[PDB]
Write a protein that binds this ligand. Structure first.
Ligand SMILES: CC(C)(COP(=O)(O)OP(=O)(O)OC[C@H]1O[C@@H](n2cnc3c(N)ncnc32)[C@H](O)[C@@H]1OP(=O)(O)O)[C@@H](O)C(=O)NCCC(=O)NCCS
Ligand SMILES: CC(C)(COP(=O)(O)OP(=O)(O)OC[C@H]1O[C@@H](n2cnc3c(N)ncnc32)[C@H](O)[C@@H]1OP(=O)(O)O)[C@@H](O)C(=O)NCCC(=O)NCCS
Ligand SMILES: CC(C)(COP(=O)(O)OP(=O)(O)OC[C@H]1O[C@@H](n2cnc3c(N)ncnc32)[C@H](O)[C@@H]1OP(=O)(O)O)[C@@H](O)C(=O)NCCC(=O)NCCS
Ligand SMILES: N[C@@H](CCCCC(=O)O)C(=O)O
Ligand SMILES: N[C@@H](CCCCC(=O)O)C(=O)O
Ligand SMILES: N[C@@H](CCCCC(=O)O)C(=O)O
Lengths: 274, 274, 274
């Protein structure tokens, strides 16, 4: 959308000088529209095209800009209070809407406005930040976190305590992406724009960033920045040249098989009852 | 109880075809009774008998079935809203009851109905899922999670961010069990029906599943599926046949002693004041 | 303050015999004053003096004593209820106050009374326990935990799921300390009075306790208990004498540089708008 894009990219350049008071009504109404579109899935920060994920940098700008144009407000919890500038996604929903939207929200799961939640997903208690997109069939398990602008595929299982990197602090060039049908093992972390290709199974306690060597014991090939589709990755170490010590690395031990599929499947009985 | 068992096991077979509307009042009243019994500790998903832990598969069925027979309902948080089908355990408690029940619930700790919480336990902010059983004296520290049907012994310390595997998704044959007097180190995970025998101390960042080699450096013996009573386990790696790389494993470095006991004890002053 | 110190240290000696009912009004009024001072930053459990961090053991006593002198009370969450004895810090705040205090509290971030939160900090959903002190500019990211009495410097970034050890259970001699300008990587844990010196960058999945060997590959020097200022630490392993297996250790791979600074900076746009 050019009528929105334009205004957004104009303002971003004056980011540091914009405040909730000196901001003109145009930039305000706009930034707000672009956030409403992300909330709805009509726009998404990154998308795959011609087998390549592409980042719409300017949508990442509007996300950033919302923090310069909005002012904090007291939010009454019940036993405590909060003070923040990003509204709660579900604050206005009634049953009708939850009924039409088709997902399940387990207390005290929390989602910020500007994040897209797809039909048939289950959010156990966890956090979904602004601009993230969570596709169909996915479960975000206990204490997991879907970082700002992150892109999560359909039928994904983010295990308990899993963290998917955001792009706000520290600031990142690209969002983190988990393609369709992946299983991310408990307590694992995926950050810094790494891409986990479809059908991959990341074991527990695996940490993947741009500096992580993803080692393929079979080919001897060492990847960086992405997990090839259908891999099973687990933690290991690689030895120093002098065998003096070893440093952490991710090891692709094999390609997903029935033995693997046995342990990581989605439980349809927990999904939406048609 | 045969009058309950029977009905439950009948229905389970038609699991995929049962919905919150076509379910007959018998199966409904029953499933509901079996959940009320679990909530109360009168029944428990697994139990030790003749020095062997046994799983009552049919109680795991009722847990599963509750998701087919109940419909979602809007739950009003304060600043947001939720939409789910498993009631909150403590929603009806008054002080009298909390006073009689003898445990402490730190906001915003959350427990689902169908989980048993014993006297003198302390729940820091954390999650206890349906069907779990948490025994006397235990503390569930910050952001820890007690997975569906998991069995936690007396006087256990589940450190911050610790995750004890559930049995719902991915679906599991047996619950995860932590016997009496164990200390589970921060950010560690125990899943897939592994058993941690009494008096063991699992260090921080230890991940135990059925595929985890538990190596006893002293005996050279490699375990799978269980931690022998009184062990102290920490993370390590085992080398490839070609010394090319190494893969994660759990290492039993020693048997618990006073030096160890010094660092992992329970603080009675925090327990219930008699 | 001697008029407070005295009373506190008197009572501590009778800790096990004091209860919310047999405690005399003096010890009660006092313990309560010392907690109000910690809440305000007027007193702090540990402080650096002459380039040495010092622990005021007697302030740690008052923290402990508050659990013996206060009785539990029902706290009404919205969808559930809690039963605990430490009030919520922000329960009384209005916008005026939040406005004057200058920090941001993202729901459902929770802080106990007795903890000091400095100006310009951002608390994503996380936990700050009694007696902790969080200095200026710092962000406590999602599901992080600042343990009882822990001391966090200015401009620190505690990543998602990071745990900073408390001193309550298990009981500890000294608090855990993170000096100014440090970045603690996702899912990492720092406990047992370890000190992370200023400007250090701890990678993801690093676990530091008193038994952790911090290995400097360059000097060959092995530290214990502290991370030398300006280090970049990541997980590795050290080999057994027989190369039979290896055990976890922290490895100082280098001194912080621009490449590093690129990935861990604070995002000022998210801080308080002056
Ligand atoms: C990866 C995993 C699924 C095992 O899958 P699998 O296909 O059965 O793998 P296998 O048991 O055949 O092992 C394959 C190889 O990798 C190793 N392996 C598998 N999982 C491993 C793990 N967690 N740690 C170390 N090694 C592991 C095996 O030792 C084996 O090595 P080898 O070929 O040299 O002998 C299991 O390790 C896992 O991650 N489970 C997830 C638990 C979880 O996160 N639950 C969520 C609770 S919310
Ligand atoms: C396991 C632990 C308790 C140490 O216990 P300990 O009995 O004092 O163990 P020691 O210091 O004697 O070390 C025993 C051996 O294991 C190693 N060891 C112990 N803990 C280790 C750890 N965390 N990482 C690596 N090695 C460790 C030591 O290097 C030593 O090896 P060695 O025999 O080859 O020299 C400590 O490591 C730990 O896990 N603390 C828990 C912290 C925690 O989770 N706090 C909770 C905050 S909510
Ligand atoms: C430490 C980190 C910042 C990399 O910093 P860096 O200065 O760019 O480090 P480099 O990429 O130059 O690597 C330095 C050395 O350490 C290793 N290294 C760096 N980070 C590593 C990691 N996470 N795992 C393993 N090795 C790592 C490199 O392999 C390299 O080893 P070498 O010198 O033998 O080749 C990055 O690893 C990291 O921790 N990012 C934090 C992500 C995070 O927690 N995000 C928060 C989301 S809430
Ligand atoms: N590491 C997180 C920090 C988000 C901060 C959001 C906020 O200030 O409200 C991310 O990049 O998503
Ligand atoms: N991994 C978790 C998932 C629980 C889902 C519960 C729900 O759908 O409400 C467990 O097996 O306990
Ligand atoms: N490991 C945590 C336990 C805190 C318990 C607080 C409570 O009982 O209320 C700490 O030492 O800070």
């Amino acid at each position: 959308m050019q009528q929105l894009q334009n205004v957004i990219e104009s303002a971003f350049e004056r980011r540091a000088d914009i405040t909730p008071a000196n901001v003109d009504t145009v930039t305000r109404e706009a930034v707000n529209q672009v956030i409403g579109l992300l909330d709805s899935g009509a726009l998404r920060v990154a998308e795959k095209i011609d087998g390549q994920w592409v980042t719409h940098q300017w949508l990442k700008k509007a996300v950033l800009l919302s923090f310069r144009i909005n002012d904090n407000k007291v939010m009454d919890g019940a036993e405590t209070r909060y003070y923040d500038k990003v509204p709660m996604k579900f604050a206005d929903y009634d049953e009708a809407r939850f009924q039409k939207e088709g997902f399940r929200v387990v207390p005290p799961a929390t989602v910020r406005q500007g994040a897209f939640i797809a039909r048939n997903t289950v959010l156990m208690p966890s956090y979904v930040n602004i601009g993230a997109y969570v596709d169909e069939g996915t479960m975000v398990d206990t204490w997991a976190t879907v970082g700002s602008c992150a892109q999560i595929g359909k039928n994904v299982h983010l295990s308990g305590g899993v963290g998917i990197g955001g792009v706000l602090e520290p600031l990142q060039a690209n969002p983190t992406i988990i393609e369709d049908n992946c299983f991310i093992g408990a307590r694992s972390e995926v950050v810094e724009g790494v891409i986990v290709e479809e059908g991959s199974v990341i074991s527990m306690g695996v940490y993947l960033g741009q500096s992580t060597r993803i080692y393929d014991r079979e080919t001897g090939e060492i990847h960086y920045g992405r997990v090839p589709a259908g891999s099973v990755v687990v933690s290991g170490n690689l030895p120093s040249k002098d065998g003096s010590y070893s440093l952490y690395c991710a090891v692709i031990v094999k390609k997903v098989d029935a033995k693997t599929r046995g342990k990581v499947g989605i439980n349809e009985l927990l999904r939406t009852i048609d």
